[PDB]
Amino acid sequence: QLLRIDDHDFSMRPGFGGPAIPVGVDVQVESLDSISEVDMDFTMTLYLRHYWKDERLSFPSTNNLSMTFDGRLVKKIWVPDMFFVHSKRSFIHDTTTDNVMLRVQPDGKVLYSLRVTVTAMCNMDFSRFPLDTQTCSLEIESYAYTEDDLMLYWKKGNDSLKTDERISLSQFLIQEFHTTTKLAFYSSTGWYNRLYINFTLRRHIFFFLLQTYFPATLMVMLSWVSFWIDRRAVPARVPLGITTVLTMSTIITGVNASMPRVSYIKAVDIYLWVSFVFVFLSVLEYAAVNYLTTVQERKEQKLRDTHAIDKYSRIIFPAAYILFNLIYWSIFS
Amino acid sequence: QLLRIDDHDFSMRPGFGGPAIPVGVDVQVESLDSISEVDMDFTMTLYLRHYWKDERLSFPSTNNLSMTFDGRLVKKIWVPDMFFVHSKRSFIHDTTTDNVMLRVQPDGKVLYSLRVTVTAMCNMDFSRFPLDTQTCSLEIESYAYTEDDLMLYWKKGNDSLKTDERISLSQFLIQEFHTTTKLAFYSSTGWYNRLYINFTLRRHIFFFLLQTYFPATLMVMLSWVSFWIDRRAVPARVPLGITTVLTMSTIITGVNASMPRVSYIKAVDIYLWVSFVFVFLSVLEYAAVNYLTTVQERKEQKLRDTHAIDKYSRIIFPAAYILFNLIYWSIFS
Amino acid sequence: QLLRIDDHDFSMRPGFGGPAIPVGVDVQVESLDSISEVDMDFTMTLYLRHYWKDERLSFPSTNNLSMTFDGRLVKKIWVPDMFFVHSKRSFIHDTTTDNVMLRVQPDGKVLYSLRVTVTAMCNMDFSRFPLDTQTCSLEIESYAYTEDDLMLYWKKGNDSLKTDERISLSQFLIQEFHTTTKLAFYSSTGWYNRLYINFTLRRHIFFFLLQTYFPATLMVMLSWVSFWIDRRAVPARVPLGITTVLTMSTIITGVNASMPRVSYIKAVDIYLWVSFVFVFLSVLEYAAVNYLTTVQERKEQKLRDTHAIDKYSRIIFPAAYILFNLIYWSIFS
Amino acid sequence: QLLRIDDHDFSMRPGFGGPAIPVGVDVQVESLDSISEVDMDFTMTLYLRHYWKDERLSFPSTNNLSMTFDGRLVKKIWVPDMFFVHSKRSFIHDTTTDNVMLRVQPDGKVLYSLRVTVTAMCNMDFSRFPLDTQTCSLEIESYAYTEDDLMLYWKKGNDSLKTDERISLSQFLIQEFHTTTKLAFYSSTGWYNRLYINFTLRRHIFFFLLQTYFPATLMVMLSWVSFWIDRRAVPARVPLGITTVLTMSTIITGVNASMPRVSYIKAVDIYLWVSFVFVFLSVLEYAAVNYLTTVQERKEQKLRDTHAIDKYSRIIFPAAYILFNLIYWSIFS
Amino acid sequence: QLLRIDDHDFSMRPGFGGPAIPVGVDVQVESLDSISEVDMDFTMTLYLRHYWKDERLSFPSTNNLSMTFDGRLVKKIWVPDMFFVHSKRSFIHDTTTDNVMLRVQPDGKVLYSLRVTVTAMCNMDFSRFPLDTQTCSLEIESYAYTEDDLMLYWKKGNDSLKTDERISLSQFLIQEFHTTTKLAFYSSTGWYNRLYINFTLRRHIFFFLLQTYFPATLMVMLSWVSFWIDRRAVPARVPLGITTVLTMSTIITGVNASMPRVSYIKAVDIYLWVSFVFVFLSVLEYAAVNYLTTVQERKEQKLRDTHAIDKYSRIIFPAAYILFNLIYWSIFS
Ligand SMILES: C[C@]12CC[C@@H](O)C[C@@H]1CC[C@@H]1[C@@H]2CC[C@]2(C)[C@@H](C(=O)CO)CC[C@@H]12
Ligand SMILES: C[C@]12CC[C@@H](O)C[C@@H]1CC[C@@H]1[C@@H]2CC[C@]2(C)[C@@H](C(=O)CO)CC[C@@H]12
Ligand SMILES: C[C@]12CC[C@@H](O)C[C@@H]1CC[C@@H]1[C@@H]2CC[C@]2(C)[C@@H](C(=O)CO)CC[C@@H]12
Ligand SMILES: C[C@]12CC[C@@H](O)C[C@@H]1CC[C@@H]1[C@@H]2CC[C@]2(C)[C@@H](C(=O)CO)CC[C@@H]12
Ligand SMILES: C[C@]12CC[C@@H](O)C[C@@H]1CC[C@@H]1[C@@H]2CC[C@]2(C)[C@@H](C(=O)CO)CC[C@@H]12
Ligand SMILES: *[C@@H]1O[C@H](CO)[C@@H](O)[C@H](O)[C@H]1NC(C)=O
Ligand SMILES: *[C@@H]1O[C@H](CO)[C@@H](O)[C@H](O)[C@H]1NC(C)=O
Ligand SMILES: *[C@@H]1O[C@H](CO)[C@@H](O)[C@H](O)[C@H]1NC(C)=O
Ligand SMILES: *[C@@H]1O[C@H](CO)[C@@H](O)[C@H](O)[C@H]1NC(C)=O
Ligand SMILES: *[C@@H]1O[C@H](CO)[C@@H](O)[C@H](O)[C@H]1NC(C)=O
Ligand SMILES: CCCCCCCCCCCC
Ligand SMILES: CCCCCCCCCCCC
Ligand SMILES: CCCCCCCCCCCC
Ligand SMILES: CCCCCCCCCCCC
Ligand SMILES: CCCCCCCCCCCC
Ligand SMILES: CCCCCCCC
Ligand SMILES: CCCCCCCC
Ligand SMILES: CCCCCCCC
Ligand SMILES: CCCCCC
Ligand SMILES: CCCCCC
Ligand SMILES: CCCCCC
Ligand SMILES: CCCCCC
Ligand SMILES: CCCCCC
């Protein structure tokens, strides 16, 4: 055998009982899979690499080059114990075998690589939905060793993160990958070193525009055509307003089907409910006109053209709606 | 080897055949994941720690400090056998390796830590839904050893429970974590000691308000505008009431889609069905008015203005609805 | 070692080549989890215990008391081979270790306990749904040994079944747990002994009442108010009947969404379709009245008050509906 | 030990390097679970048995009877390697242990039994849906050995298939179980022997009748009552036809929700679209009548009873619908 | 033993420390399972075969023919380490045993075969949906060895890919299977050789035609019948247009339920929204006619037949719709 595995006890780390051992980390991201608003999490696939030195794995040679071993030798040597903090589930791919790489140099330097898929939590804010922007991160830490036993750092600084050129999401734009570091404390175990991978997402607005904003505006404009119809056709003007109200209610109900039940109002809700109020007032206007006409007829009868309300509504309603749209799209850009 | 594993039989507990062995327990909660009303359960992730002494694991040293071992040595020594009572499913995280920690002091004291995810049952009461409050707990017990063999207790009393500062639920407010203890009996195996983790949840009401209570009130108010319309427009006043009835029915049907089929009435059902009855009576009022008008016309014909019912309805209906709202929101706060 | 495991061949049962060995069985039920109408199955969690004697496990002592062993010794001795007949899936809980107990007395008596979750088939009859009652059972049998090798029986007769005081289902009432026994034959392997666990379920009716029966009756009563409206308002009386028909159809469609596609009619279907027929006839009545009125007008014209049909309908329709309800609720209680 | 396992190398089949070894197969079917039209597959549970002879498993005795072994001895001997062709997923039940049986006679004959659940593909034709009939099969073959190494056959001919007396499907009738055999070729590995299990399914028609065919016929008949209403009530005759059209469209949309998107028309689609066309023509008839009446009035005005179209429609529409029904139900039986 | 396994160290590849070892690859495709538009992936099942030479597996014989071994010998020898690039999940079938084949010739040539199921990503473009065409591929590469250690190539060139004669998809047409090769680079590990399997899919259009395009055209044509109705029936002409608008909106909402939220418009959306605009303009036309008629009546009153707009609309609307259809079906074929 080229490696003297049987001569050592690999239940103890290199430098056991002494100074801490440094371990470097390098990463390449392969894909971003899915994003859930109800669960508030994301899924990622990536390659994870480790670097350290262990003098028990030294072997003699003349070329001084790395050699590759098959990968079932991993379970017989010491290996770091990284885990993903705040994750829900994860696994290691194993077809047609375990996706594991092991390379050793003659002096004892080791490279160790894995392929994993992780689901991790992300806390999202929906006050500007669907014109919102989110920030998420992934955290890496050792489970068992404190900073007095294992020192964890990025292998090459800022150059330690790479991404695939094919990374894409159908509903979001991805930008600004970078890495950071921070210490963490547990009240009963000690201090640990954490690594972070940060990125930002921006949602696409076109679908929501065409699917939600256009129909509501069309219904609001459809409510205005009743002001131009003769007031003597009562069963021609009542159903138009009633149907507009019902369709607006259906749109409002259908919009919320995909979202969690948060305790605050979103940007699209304001628009939809203002439109609903506009249509409701349009319905009340004709009732006022009809009542006043009947009262006037009775008063003229007891003594033995267009009403002003319609004429004013024809100008007042569109101007108010246009002003609301100006303010709304200035605030939410 | 530093530890003399091969010299002992670890199929027997420490102090086998004698007094019971004490085991202490410490916990840190990482997250609360999901809550299901149809299944009546919750999911939790946490770190679980054990403390005991075993003289077979003693080794010589001079510094008198804990040493950390890699974690594959767990399957060769004796270890406690805790399990979660009344749970549906659970697992131990295992990427990139088993999330396990093992630390031993020179005298033989042991610390053993794990990372687990559990789904557990909780019995919920929905009589005040959606203005309700729930209480749930998680139970820990040994499977095989009775109190004559193993003594289970909280390691530091009330200071044995910690929580993450990021614990959050989108639909609930979390409060009042605390711990208790109680004995349990099985008729064919004996007495056991149980540990409890208790907490309380309060639901957020804003979403339900805006989604359910506002539309029903708007429909009820929309039914009242017919009292102000001339009674000679029969096909203008019938469709308004009919459409209000149908929309109320649709809202009632849509509300129940997310809930289990309990054998009692909930708080929101009372409100919705009272609103439905209000709209139904609004429909019946116009039929009465029309019948009386036709009868009066026939009687006046055989001899050769606003009806009182509308005038009274205009005041009676809103006052009754306001009184109902006052009583309802005083009872359910 | 206290037990002489290495001195025996545990691939053979106790009393190999001779008379059969008796094995007793004891059970405690922990929970009933879910019931599926489309799949026709249920899920159960329980503790399962075995009793037998094996002289190869004898050890010397003075106190004559049971001793508990850690549980990894199970895979080195002989153990029975029970399985669940007619089951779809099952597993054994394994956090934080296998939920297994092993106790041995000095003479060689053994107690062996496990914690399992099972999904099993149950054949349900829905002719009286949703006022129905179902009966289900769970079956236990050895896989490999016939009655000439292994004798299976209940350990203490009728006292061998216990249940948790917290067992509950949100939609059903649980009653009448009991146990039975019966022999089974396979044409190519032989005779086997089976154990049964029987129980009964009764569904709660309140939700179905409030959700389905009340709206249909309200629609049927809403169809009757047209008989009191003047016959000269044709576009006021046609839409009322049409909308009642459409709403009844929607209710009928929504009711069936949760049920399997059986080849017979259920109790609720009869009620819903009779209501639909009532509303359809209500629609036809006004067409008859209108046609007769127009014919009479033409006949009176060519020579140069309330129609009887409405007056009779006002009494005939409610009486028939009340009679149908009396008969229906006498038959289905 | 009764069996001399350690004295042989069980990585080689019986008769290695010589003539092929015969293996017989016997089957009992326990249940048919589910049928998916969108995925076009079915699920089955069954017991699978194997028969062969291996002289390395001979042991001495006097009674000459089969002996049963616990079942963990399977992983130490040679065993056949059957797999299910064209399957999507499958598993072996393992509670409370692996559902495995092993019986050996003193001369070396072996019986080996398993309990499995399989999901397999079936290609379905929906041109006569929902009055259709389907045929499906399950295929069994060895993975690694060609016919020159292993000979696969039915153990007892036609008597090798048994079924449970409780096998049932809620939506189908099951009939005609039988078995066949055929050879298969792979261009790079060789020739193999396949076994088949065939059966037929017939769908139940009652639910589809009551749910789909009756409402469409009722809507078509409801369209005809307008021919008997006076032509001077325009806003009483337009809404009736419009509502019938809309309800027919809703029924058509609701019918297709459960089916895959095939590239041909089904039997129910023809009926629904013919009904839709009938209602559309009913709407056009009144427009023609109204236009002709207005033209006649203008012509009579410029010179200073029932229209024939209604009278003919009253007879022509029902006769055509009855003729269509006769032809349709003669073709599709 | 025929093979001298115990005399060698199989943690090192053949030709360790020297020139690279060639490995050939051959494939037969069994099925294509499912295609997801929201997830943008596909599932495939196939047989995978490897070819190489290892002199450590030589054995003496006279016939010079391949011999088959049981398959548990795989875990004791060296074997290649292929994996699927850009895949989400995969597994190896294992009933009734691992689907693995191992054949060795006396000189040391090896054949090794497996049966696997893979889910892999495919980037789809929906600008021409549902008249679109997609191209997908599957990628095979070694995980641990670079081109200086292992040379990967197609075993027989273009003749290395076979497909089953039963491969079918219900919604797509499959064509043009072929293979390619390309080198790949990782910035921290080196150069690797990749193999590709390419194919093309074309969707079936019949279902979408009958389900979506026909109803929208029918609604558009139904909007035109109002131009032929007398303008004095206001509550007969308003509801027709309103109902057409609402039904068009429902169709548009129902179409999008199955698709991802892309940031561009699809082919079917253009058609549906143009139809919606047509119906909206149809509604506005009658409002214009009514307003002009009322104004003319007032003007004629103050001094003390068919309107031109309807007559022109009857020709202008159908011609514009026909022209739009011509252009649309010329562009999208
Ligand atoms: C056309 C529509 C949506 C569809 C109807 O509701 C009408 C509004 C009018 C205002 C528009 C808006 C789409 C989004 C716009 C173009 C805004 C943006 O630049 C977005 O970043 C500024 C003004 C906005
Ligand atoms: C506005 C709305 C809901 C929307 C319509 O139904 C009208 C009611 C009127 C009474 C309101 C209620 C919302 C909840 C309120 C504010 C109660 C609370 O403090 C809740 O803790 C007291 C009075 C309640
Ligand atoms: C109120 C309602 C349901 C809601 C409307 O359909 C009207 C019926 C009238 C008859 C009622 C029935 C509910 C169930 C009752 C009370 C029966 C039972 O004791 C049930 O065990 C006997 C009479 C039944
Ligand atoms: C009653 C209904 C369905 C409900 C309405 O559409 C009217 C048709 C009329 C023709 C009937 C059909 C049901 C199926 C029948 C009875 C056919 C069969 O024996 C079926 O095998 C022959 C004639 C068919
Ligand atoms: C009948 C229908 C769909 C249903 C209504 O919208 C009317 C159009 C009219 C134009 C037709 C189209 C179906 C697809 C056709 C036949 C095109 C194709 O050869 C497709 O490759 C050319 C013209 C197209
Ligand atoms: C990347 O690292 C460099 C060097 O430490 C630092 O100056 C820079 O701010 C980092 N970039 C980001 C985006 O954090
Ligand atoms: C916590 O423990 C202390 C000490 O036993 C006890 O007094 C106190 O009531 C406990 N708190 C709760 C909330 O149970
Ligand atoms: C319980 O067992 C006893 C004794 O065998 C028997 O008499 C009784 O009928 C059983 N009870 C039931 C409910 O089967
Ligand atoms: C069953 O097998 C017999 C004997 O080979 C054969 O004659 C018969 O046709 C088979 N039955 C069927 C239904 O295939
Ligand atoms: C198949 O391989 C041959 C030989 O290399 C090549 O000429 C041909 O273009 C290939 N076919 C395809 C479709 O790539
Ligand atoms: C009826 C729609 C009115 C739209 C008014 C235009 C809004 C433009 C806002 C631009 C702010 C940047
Ligand atoms: C039409 C809505 C009437 C709402 C009446 C106000 C209810 C306030 C109740 C306050 C009780 C604390
Ligand atoms: C309109 C509802 C009529 C309900 C008639 C009462 C039915 C009571 C049946 C009691 C039988 C036990
Ligand atoms: C309006 C429904 C007409 C139904 C006509 C009867 C069809 C019977 C067909 C019998 C063919 C075997
Ligand atoms: C109302 C439907 C009009 C359809 C006009 C025919 C379109 C044919 C386009 C052929 C282009 C190849
Ligand atoms: C809901 C009340 C409407 C009142 C309308 C009366 C206009 C003066
Ligand atoms: C459903 C019956 C309505 C009766 C209305 C008659 C008013 C006197
Ligand atoms: C001259 C026709 C007036 C119609 C205006 C409609 C505005 C929505
Ligand atoms: C809609 C407001 C009209 C005001 C008339 C004085
Ligand atoms: C709605 C009640 C009116 C009472 C008239 C006497
Ligand atoms: C509804 C039946 C009326 C009978 C009139 C003679
Ligand atoms: C519906 C066709 C009527 C024919 C009148 C000549
Ligand atoms: C619809 C356009 C009509 C033009 C009349 C001048």
Give chain B's length. Answer: 333
How far does residue C295's CA lie from ligand 7's centre (Å)? 89
Structure tokens at B237: 């006043």
Which bound ligand lies closest to the C-alpha atom of B220?
12
**Paired residues of D113 in beta bridges:** D49, D101
Judge whether C95 and B120 are in contact, CB under 8 Å. Answer: no
Instruction: Verify that A63 and A152 share a domain, yes or no.
Output: yes
Least CB–CB distance from D93: residue in C89, C260, C283: C89
Closest CA to D87 of D123, D120, D65: D120
Residue A158 near ligand 6, beta carbon < 6 Å? yes
Structure tokens at C258: 């949760």
Judge whether E35 and E90 are in contact, CB under 8 Å. Answer: no
Peptide bond into D250 cis (omega under 30): no
Instruction: Verify that A230 and A130 share a domain, yes or no.
Output: no
Contact list in E for residue D16 (CB cut-off 8 A) is: 67
- Can you tell me the distance from the alpha carbon of C104 to that of D10, in angstroms, rounded to the nearest whole number? 36
Structure tokens at A21: 């051992």
Q: Which residues, 6 or more positions from C222, have their beta carbon under 8 angstroms from its beta carbon?
A: B245, B280, B283, C240, C244
Residue of minimum CA distance from atom 20 in ligand 4: D333
Least CB–CB distance from C11: residue in D73, D171, D225: D73
**Paired residues of C44 in beta bridges:** C32, C118
The secondary structure of C22-64 as a DSSP string is EEEEEEEEEEEEEEETTTTEEEEEEEEEEEEE-GGG----SS-
Interchain pair C230, B189: CB under 8 A: no
Q: Is the dihedral of CA A232, A235, A236, A240 positive or negative?
A: positive
Residue of minimum CA distance from atom 11 in ligand 6: A178
Least CB–CB distance from D143: residue in E99, E162, E168: E99
- Can you tell me the distance from the alpha carbon of D70 to that of C78, in angstroms, rounded to the nearest whole number? 8
Contact list in E for residue A206 (CB cut-off 8 A) is: 263-265
Rounded to 5, what percent of chain B is helix, strand, coil?
35, 30, 30
Judge whether D150 and D76 are in contact, CB under 8 Å. Answer: no
Judged by DSSP in three states, E95 sits in coil
Query: Rounded to an integer, what is the distance from CA B115 to the centroid of its chain?
Result: 23
Instruction: Verify that C229 and C268 share a domain, yes or no.
Output: yes
Structure tokens at E106: 């006396």
- Can you tell me the distance from the alpha carbon of A23 to that of A109, in angstroms, rounded to the nearest whole number? 11
- Can you tell me the distance from the alpha carbon of A54 to that of A157, in angstroms, rounded to the nearest whole number? 23
Euclidean distance between the first and final Cα of chain D, in Å? 69
Peptide bond into B106 cis (omega under 30): no
- Can you tell me the distance from the alpha carbon of A296 to that of A300, in angstroms, rounded to the nearest whole number? 6
Judged by DSSP in three states, B37 sits in coil
**DSSP-assigned letter for residue E62:** S
Structure tokens at E285: 């036309």
Residue located via tokens 């997310």: B258
How far does residue B217's CA lie from ligand 2's centre (Å)? 11
Among C150, C179, C204, the domain boundary falls at: C204
Closest CA to D258 of D88, D32, D33, D36: D36
Q: Which helix (H) or strand (E) holds C153?
A: strand C150-154
Instruction: Verify that A133 and A176 share a domain, yes or no.
Output: yes
Q: For residue A296, is it left (φ>0), alpha (ψ between -120 and 50) or beta?
A: alpha
Q: Which helix (H) or strand (E) holds D185?
A: strand D172-186
Structure tokens at B283: 């429909």
Residue E178 near ligand 10, beta carbon < 6 Å? yes
Instruction: Verify that D54 and D199 share a domain, yes or no.
Output: yes
Among B182, B204, B226, the domain boundary falls at: B204
CA distance C221 to chain B (A): 11
Q: At what angle do helices A267-302 and A234-255 cross, to 10 degrees?
A: 160
Judge whether A119 and A41 are in contact, CB under 8 Å. Answer: yes
Judge whether C305 and B298 are in contact, CB under 8 Å. Answer: yes
- Can you tell me the distance from the alpha carbon of D205 to that of D133, in angstroms, rounded to the nearest whole number? 12
Beta strand extents in chain E (DSSP E only) = 21-36, 41-53, 67-69, 82-85, 87-92, 100-104, 109-121, 133-142, 150-154, 161-163, 172-186, 190-203
- Can you tell me the distance from the alpha carbon of C314 to that of C308, in angstroms, rounded to the nearest whole number? 10
Residue located via tokens 């080791």: A110
Judge whether C93 and C115 are in contact, CB under 8 Å. Answer: yes
Structure tokens at C58: 């004898």
To test the pocket of ligand 8, the residue of C178, C180, C198, C199 to mutate (highest count of ligand atoms within 8 Å of its CB) is: C178
Q: At what angle do helices E214-223 and E267-302 cross, to 10 degrees?
A: 10
- Can you tell me the distance from the alpha carbon of E156 to that of E141, in angstroms, rounded to the nearest whole number? 18
Least CB–CB distance from C239: residue in B187, B239, B253: B239
Residue B156 near ligand 7, beta carbon < 6 Å? no
Interchain pair A16, B162: CB under 8 A: no
As for how many domains chain D has, the answer is: 2
Instruction: Verify that B147 and B266 share a domain, yes or no.
Output: no
CB atoms within 10 A of CB B209: 11
Pairs across A and B, CB distance < 8 A: 126
- Can you tell me the distance from the alpha carbon of C2 to that of C59, in angstroms, rounded to the nearest whole number? 7
Peptide bond into D22 cis (omega under 30): no
Give chain E's length. Answer: 333
Gap sites in chain A (C to N > 2.5 Å), preceding residue numbers = 304
List the domain range (segments joined by +) for residue C306: 205-333
Instruction: Verify that B45 and B147 share a domain, yes or no.
Output: yes
Residue B284 near ligand 20, beta carbon < 6 Å? no
Choose from E75, E83, E89, E147 for mutation: most chain A CBs within 10 A.
E83
The secondary structure of D77-93 as a DSSP string is S----EEEETEEEEEE-
Q: How far is CA B77 from CA A11, B56, B74, B116, D185, in A?
A: 14, 10, 6, 21, 54
Residue located via tokens 């705040």: A86
Instruction: Verify that D137 and D15 share a domain, yes or no.
Output: yes
Judge whether B60 and B2 are in contact, CB under 8 Å. Answer: no
Instruction: Verify that D157 and D72 share a domain, yes or no.
Output: yes
Among D162, D189, D204, the domain boundary falls at: D204
- Can you tell me the distance from the alpha carbon of D211 to that of D130, in angstroms, rounded to the nearest whole number? 12
Instruction: Verify that E179 and E268 share a domain, yes or no.
Output: no
- Can you tell me the distance from the alpha carbon of B219 to that of B277, in angstroms, rounded to the nearest whole number? 12
Instruction: Verify that A197 and A209 share a domain, yes or no.
Output: no
Judge whether B174 and B203 are in contact, CB under 8 Å. Answer: no
Tell me the one-letter amino acid at D98.
D
Beta strand extents in A125-227 (DSSP E only) = 133-142, 150-154, 161-163, 172-186, 190-203
Which bound ligand lies closest to the C-alpha atom of A327?
11
Judged by DSSP in three states, E185 sits in strand
- The answer on whether A58 is annotated among ligand-binding residues is no
- Can you tell me the distance from the alpha carbon of A141 to that of E196, in angstroms, rounded to the nearest whole number? 37
How far does residue D329's CA lie from ligand 17's centre (Å)? 46
Instruction: Verify that A192 and A144 share a domain, yes or no.
Output: yes
For the purposes of burial, counting CB atoms within 10 Å of the CB of C250, is it exposed (0-12), middle (13-18) or buried (19 or more)? middle
Judge whether D21 and D1 are in contact, CB under 8 Å. Answer: no
